[PDB]
Amino acid sequence: GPSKPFWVLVVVGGVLAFYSLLVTVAFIIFWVRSKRSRLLH
Amino acid sequence: GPSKPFWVLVVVGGVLAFYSLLVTVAFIIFWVRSKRSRLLH
Numbered sequence: 001g002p003s004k005p006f007w008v009l010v011v012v013g014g015v016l017a018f019y020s021l022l023v024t025v026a027f028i029i030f031w032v033r034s035k036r037s038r039l040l041h
Numbered sequence: 042g043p044s045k046p047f048w049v050l051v052v053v054g055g056v057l058a059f060y061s062l063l064v065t066v067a068f069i070i071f072w073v074r075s076k077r078s079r080l081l082h
Contacts, residue, residue, distance in 0.1 A: 009049075012050055013057065016058065021058060025066055029069075032070065
């Protein structure tokens with residue numbers, strides 16, 4: 001009647017996976033790439 | 042009544058994010074690490 005917990009489970013695992021993966025992974029890419037501090041080869 | 046909801050939310054979202062993040066993050070970094078390595082010229 002009031003929806004099953006299956007909703008709160010997909011909603012949490014869904015947003016957490018995209019937000020944590022894109023924000024955390026992108027953070028690593030900028031940390032080692034920015035460490036260069038210079039370009040032009 | 043007791044079904045350990047918070048426990049599964051952290052365990053499920055914790056492993057899923059650590060698996061795709063640890064394997065994918067290490068995959069891209071190692072790709073340019075070997076190609077941009079050479080050290081044999």
